[PDB]
Copies of this chain bind each other. A is one copy, B any other.
């Protein structure tokens, strides 16, 4: 059997908006889906899931997919955060959804999310000139050309990475 890299990804307790955290675990075992992946831990003081003296946190795998960047047999592991007593940590917002998801499974709710974002180079918007403003809006949206398109290389690389991960992307 094989040795592979597992990227454990989780959400912290930062306010007002929580942030992603991740670290790499090197696993030497026979591959299996999710259930065979070890629970792990981290230091909460560093992630606002303590910033105190009593919170050490537990990482519990809830989702996994291939790591498109690392490639090969490497994987991404999305985790939920638990207290040392295996109850959901207060920052954990997944556990509430899982309860409601189960409660209303008969209705079969389905979601599509259209996720927007903006590129920056430092403090500057990537599509902005240094110290200034670009032309007013109108030609950027669904645009083409160097004058109006910024970051396409990134967007294309990201899209390819998401599909390779098996994520349900319908468009960009």
Residues of A within 8 A of B (CB): 128-135
Contacts and interface: CB of A to CB of B under 8 A. Distances in A.
A123 to B, nearest CB: 15
A131 B134 CA distance: 8
16 contacts: A128-B132, A129-B129, A129-B130, A129-B131, A129-B132, A129-B133, A130-B130, A130-B131, A130-B132, A131-B132, A132-B132, A132-B133, A132-B134, A133-B133, A133-B134, A133-B135
Nearest to A128: B132
Nearest to A134: B132
Interface of A is mostly: loop
Contacts of A128: 132
Nearest to A133: B133
- Closest 8 interchain pairs by CB? A132-B132, A129-B132, A129-B131, A133-B133, A132-B133, A129-B129, A132-B134, A129-B130
A131 B132 CA distance: 8
A148 to B, nearest CB: 14
Contacts of A129: 129-133
A149 to B, nearest CB: 16
A127 to B, nearest CB: 11
Contacts of A133: 129, 132-135
Nearest to A136: B133
A81 to B, nearest CB: 44
Contacts of A134: 132-133
Nearest to A135: B133
A109 to B, nearest CB: 45
A17 B120 CA distance: 45
